[PDB]
Design a protein around this ligand. Sequence first.
Ligand SMILES: NC(=O)c1ccc[n+]([C@@H]2O[C@H](COP(=O)([O-])OP(=O)(O)OC[C@H]3O[C@@H](n4cnc5c(N)ncnc54)[C@H](O)[C@@H]3O)[C@@H](O)[C@H]2O)c1
Ligand SMILES: NC(=O)c1ccc[n+]([C@@H]2O[C@H](COP(=O)([O-])OP(=O)(O)OC[C@H]3O[C@@H](n4cnc5c(N)ncnc54)[C@H](O)[C@@H]3O)[C@@H](O)[C@H]2O)c1
Ligand SMILES: NC(=O)c1ccc[n+]([C@@H]2O[C@H](COP(=O)([O-])OP(=O)(O)OC[C@H]3O[C@@H](n4cnc5c(N)ncnc54)[C@H](O)[C@@H]3O)[C@@H](O)[C@H]2O)c1
Ligand SMILES: NC(=O)c1ccc[n+]([C@@H]2O[C@H](COP(=O)([O-])OP(=O)(O)OC[C@H]3O[C@@H](n4cnc5c(N)ncnc54)[C@H](O)[C@@H]3O)[C@@H](O)[C@H]2O)c1
Ligand SMILES: O=C(Nc1ccc(Oc2ccc(Cl)cc2O)c(Cl)c1)N1CCOCC1
Ligand SMILES: O=C(Nc1ccc(Oc2ccc(Cl)cc2O)c(Cl)c1)N1CCOCC1
Ligand SMILES: O=C(Nc1ccc(Oc2ccc(Cl)cc2O)c(Cl)c1)N1CCOCC1
Ligand SMILES: O=C(Nc1ccc(Oc2ccc(Cl)cc2O)c(Cl)c1)N1CCOCC1
Lengths: 288, 288, 288, 288
Amino acid sequence: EDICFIAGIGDTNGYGWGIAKELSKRNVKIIFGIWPPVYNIFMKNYKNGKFDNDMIIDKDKKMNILDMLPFDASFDTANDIDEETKNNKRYNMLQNYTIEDVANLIHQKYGKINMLVHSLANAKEVQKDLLNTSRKGYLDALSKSSYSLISLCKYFVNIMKPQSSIISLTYHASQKVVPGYGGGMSSAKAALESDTRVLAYHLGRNYNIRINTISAGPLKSRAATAINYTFIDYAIEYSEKYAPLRQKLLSTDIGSVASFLLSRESRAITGQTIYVDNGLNIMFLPDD
Amino acid sequence: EDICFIAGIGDTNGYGWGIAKELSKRNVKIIFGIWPPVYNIFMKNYKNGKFDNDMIIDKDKKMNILDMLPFDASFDTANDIDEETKNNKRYNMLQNYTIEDVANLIHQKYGKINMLVHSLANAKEVQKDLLNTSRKGYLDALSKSSYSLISLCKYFVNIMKPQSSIISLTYHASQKVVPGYGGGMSSAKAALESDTRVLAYHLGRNYNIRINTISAGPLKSRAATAINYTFIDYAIEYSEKYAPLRQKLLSTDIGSVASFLLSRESRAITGQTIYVDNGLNIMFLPDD
Amino acid sequence: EDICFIAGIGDTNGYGWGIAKELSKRNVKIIFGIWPPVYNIFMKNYKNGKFDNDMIIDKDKKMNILDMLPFDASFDTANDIDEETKNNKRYNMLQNYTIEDVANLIHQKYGKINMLVHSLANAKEVQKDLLNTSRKGYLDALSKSSYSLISLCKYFVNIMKPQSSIISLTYHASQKVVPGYGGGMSSAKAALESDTRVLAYHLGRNYNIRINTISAGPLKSRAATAINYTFIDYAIEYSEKYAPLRQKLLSTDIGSVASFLLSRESRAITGQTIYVDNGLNIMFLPDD
Amino acid sequence: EDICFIAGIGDTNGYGWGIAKELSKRNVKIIFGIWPPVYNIFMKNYKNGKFDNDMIIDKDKKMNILDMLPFDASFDTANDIDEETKNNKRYNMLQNYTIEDVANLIHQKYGKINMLVHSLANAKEVQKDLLNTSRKGYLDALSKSSYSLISLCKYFVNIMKPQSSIISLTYHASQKVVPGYGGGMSSAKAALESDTRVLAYHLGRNYNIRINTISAGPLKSRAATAINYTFIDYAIEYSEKYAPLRQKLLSTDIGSVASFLLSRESRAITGQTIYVDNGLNIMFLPDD
Ligand SMILES: NC(=O)c1ccc[n+]([C@@H]2O[C@H](COP(=O)([O-])OP(=O)(O)OC[C@H]3O[C@@H](n4cnc5c(N)ncnc54)[C@H](O)[C@@H]3O)[C@@H](O)[C@H]2O)c1
Ligand SMILES: NC(=O)c1ccc[n+]([C@@H]2O[C@H](COP(=O)([O-])OP(=O)(O)OC[C@H]3O[C@@H](n4cnc5c(N)ncnc54)[C@H](O)[C@@H]3O)[C@@H](O)[C@H]2O)c1
Ligand SMILES: NC(=O)c1ccc[n+]([C@@H]2O[C@H](COP(=O)([O-])OP(=O)(O)OC[C@H]3O[C@@H](n4cnc5c(N)ncnc54)[C@H](O)[C@@H]3O)[C@@H](O)[C@H]2O)c1
Ligand SMILES: NC(=O)c1ccc[n+]([C@@H]2O[C@H](COP(=O)([O-])OP(=O)(O)OC[C@H]3O[C@@H](n4cnc5c(N)ncnc54)[C@H](O)[C@@H]3O)[C@@H](O)[C@H]2O)c1
Ligand SMILES: O=C(Nc1ccc(Oc2ccc(Cl)cc2O)c(Cl)c1)N1CCOCC1
Ligand SMILES: O=C(Nc1ccc(Oc2ccc(Cl)cc2O)c(Cl)c1)N1CCOCC1
Ligand SMILES: O=C(Nc1ccc(Oc2ccc(Cl)cc2O)c(Cl)c1)N1CCOCC1
Ligand SMILES: O=C(Nc1ccc(Oc2ccc(Cl)cc2O)c(Cl)c1)N1CCOCC1
């Protein structure tokens, strides 16, 4: 009897969605954590069947969405959330959306979960290059994109079965330089990729939980479109031109590998950056 | 209905067998390629029921062994087999056992296959360390345990459908040094992990076929015992003491990962070393 | 005519000192940036000849200390420094010790410098393990240990000659897990190691400056003693027991490599993590 | 007063020569080991002044060539040289040219040496890609360009002082794929980079000798021209266009790094691949 929390959703054009579709294939209950600023739009959009098409699985199954909670990766507990976001139009008429508040809500309603997905990123200044990034700007990126992963584990470790599994999405910009991947994201993902290891050790030895990370090719998600003729269009162009696998990478191409990593079928794998990127990661020089 | 060729089983105590079992679970049909030295024993042993306990699958399955063929990875085509090997006690009574000849035999009997497993390694002077390995010994190591992959691939690709997948097995002693892993075994493993990428580019672009490699943790196999209470018993103790996951590492743990990679679930992963080893590889210092 | 700024000093038992001794060997003017809280103790200690012994270079040379400035890697400009540290006993009777204020002071007095050393770390919670680290705690570590490097480059790029060179000290805890290396340091060093690359590209293409990083073995510095029978005593124990180079790693063992990296003799090397650690980094399993 | 043996010079257009020059600058004495095919030409050419322009060092130095010996890296001892090679036009008139024989010759003439350079690579089927490389071709690649290092080391160690150092040259196509780098050259390079560690452990612990390897950028050498406006001209264009450092890569750039590693300045570095390549290796995506 299986439950998965997915932290990081605001639409259906991302990897979290990809991941939720493939998990559904093996009958796993999905709990979405939506960033509060878009929680209400996402919810109204759901009710109104915008995703009814996107919720279909090959074999005549609905995606089994157990619940849909506001979730904000920038605050660990209730006592971390500041006054300005306390007023905030959007945040104001929701509650219990810190990391710890949602680890509780979920636990409260459905018991122990046993799969966890970190699928979120923010870098206020992704626009700028690493050199022109401000401290405040850089640290937000690390807080929201890297630390949040640790913070999830701490709070969710307590509501997880043993032999549970955690994942997290990463990008190659942390190993090799991609110009334009600014704001400290590259920085942020390096730490993620390393924290993944150290967590794998603490989580592995103490609770017998596994944690891994998926290094993803480029997908024209709502968030990648925000980066920028958008660098995501160029990343996909190059990738489909040059990657050893000449096909088009789909969000479920990631979903399947994730479903695998969240399953027992992978009990011997932990602390791994796993590359799901049509093989681009292995190339040095272009063919032309 | 998929068919897979596993190159290099001698007994039910290896990773090959582990991979055989887990594939069977997913209902894929098994062609075993066996080293002539041990062909007749394996065959005799199999007939006498000795493997019957070992062919038990959890959900009351047997094992779909489609065939058991003599096979030797040193010989590419028939004009390679030297007059001595040709005439040897073991080799004289057997036929069609070069890489090309079994690629043909299998094709005639069962048509194009879609999965290919490389689970053999060999090295004359394995007991001698790198410095004291002869040229003859080292090139032999590489020939048997590295090149056989490139050759398996040259010949087998033409009897494989597109979207098919190929995996091999490696050891972490290619990346960081474990002394006692001699005779150029480290060298061959490092070659095989590089070969794995170059081939992922050629096979990827030209056949839309994927190739990957599992860097496995330590197992008490027949051939791991051969290294000179032995180095493998020490390895298994270290792993079970110092690895993030303190569970005993089972060949079916590798088995199920190999299964995953050979399936369509892994359609966007290629050219990668995947570690299946309880996460030992992430450790720098023993905590104790 | 050569000048080097070294950001991160409070005594003579660290790597910055090691680095300053070896640079002196090739007649490079040294400018120390001391953390304000210990600036005055360090200065009084200097005047009183505590370091007169440590200032000797093999070949009858004094270390040429051009100047000694208070320097605080946690504030980028004057407008970043808060009220509490504005009162602060220690900080209060010093001025111009932000990153930008010192890039100016130096420039003002001696012109363009042409070698830059980042040799500093802070992680408030190094005591704890990654899991038990707080957000505030983690982000301090990244701010002080990782971001500061970027911040140096931005401000110092402007007072550097072209063909200048920058370095930074790192630790293997970012690639492989060392238990006990907590507080987000591991995290911090990963980002450093990656920022080093991305900076190498921006700095390389724009100003023709090189930037590299030195991955150091363990040294019983004043700061390592603070970590903890102190994990630094254990790190050295293991290292001297097991590293391929059986000798004792000295702070100048690092100093020489740094002097090399800061010289023109290395004009083709950039964005590199360079391991100066008696070779420990390359080992998997112990000998026993 | 140090002596170094450079294995593999054919002309003044390679990295060997570059390494020869930079060493000379540091006043170390040069023993050249030359491949018999080109021995007589090199020698004749040298006598006729043709290299005199090329032997200019900046600070009005010449070059301290202590000796120029015939040398062939395929033959370990004299009982290896087959009757055919023994009798060949080029090989018949020359003597003491196996790895052991020159290790002896040099010892008799000049006593124990302290520096050792490995700047040779060779591969029969370099023009064919990995998939289409024969077993014969590949093992030949490995024999010549990989094993010769392990053998140079077995024999030369006993005519080397402790604290001595050994370097070899590699290409980045061992890590990420550059197609056109065939015949198993990628494979040999990957072996050599693994060999480099295993040997750093054996030589480190048993002789207190260091071994490292320079992964060089592209140079218009004689042997780089041989690969089939050629692949190397494309390589040089890519490097000079897309690398962080847009300066033209010169063999003396490698030269001076090799010098550094062979000196005591690098006493704490061993088993490493050091990249000397204008930082190209850090790039994932071309910015343009
Ligand atoms: N698509 C790609 O090109 C690509 C490639 C490689 C890796 N990735 C990674 O995959 C992951 C998913 O990104 P995506 O591409 O699916 O785009 P996306 O827009 O679906 O993902 C970003 C999501 O995170 C949310 N978010 C931001 N801050 C948050 C916070 N504090 N709390 C809760 N939610 C928050 C956003 O609202 C959004 O829903 C990211 O970590 C990204 O770094 C993406
Ligand atoms: N066992 C371990 O502890 C371990 C750990 C990590 C990696 N690996 C790797 O996994 C793979 C399989 O390991 P294993 O322990 O299961 O080995 P194993 O005990 O199954 O023996 C390998 C098999 O290959 C066969 N073989 C040898 N030479 C051959 C040739 N020329 N042609 C055809 N067949 C040949 C042998 O008869 C043997 O049955 C190897 O590549 C090994 O490097 C093993
Ligand atoms: N010795 C080792 O065991 C070892 C090993 C590998 C790497 N390193 C790295 O080497 C570098 C130097 O450390 P060390 O071992 O020489 O110890 P150290 O005590 O000399 O270095 C820390 C110095 O940084 C200073 N500092 C802290 N925060 C600062 C700030 N905001 N502004 C200015 N200065 C500040 C401290 O006062 C201290 O002088 C560090 O980056 C460390 O991570 C050390
Ligand atoms: N040139 C480049 O663009 C480049 C780039 C990266 C790495 N490298 C590496 O640097 C090293 C030297 O490269 P290079 O371009 O200077 O080569 P090169 O043009 O100097 O040729 C190598 C030399 O080795 C000699 N040689 C070949 N086989 C031999 C044998 N069996 N015994 C003794 N000598 C032998 C050849 O005569 C030749 O002079 C090689 O290992 C190469 O892989 C070269
Ligand atoms: O954080 C932002 N950007 C952003 C950028 C990259 C991201 O992810 C990736 C996208 C593509 C690749 Cl190829 C890799 C990625 O990791 C994500 Cl998920 C978000 N914002 C919010 C505030 O400012 C506007 C944009
Ligand atoms: O090649 C041989 N030995 C050998 C050594 C390692 C091997 O594989 C591994 C086993 C354990 C680990 Cl931990 C890693 C491995 O790679 C294999 Cl399959 C075989 N021979 C020939 C000489 O004696 C008989 C066995
Ligand atoms: O930042 C702190 N600790 C600290 C820890 C490790 C450090 O460096 C290293 C030391 C050893 C190795 Cl082996 C590696 C290192 O990177 C440094 Cl320079 C500082 N503090 C200040 C506040 O709390 C008390 C201790
Ligand atoms: O082995 C041969 N070719 C060859 C190829 C690459 C080599 O080295 C490299 C050159 C450029 C880069 Cl960019 C990388 C290299 O490693 C070397 Cl020294 C030699 N032969 C034999 C057949 O024809 C004559 C030359």
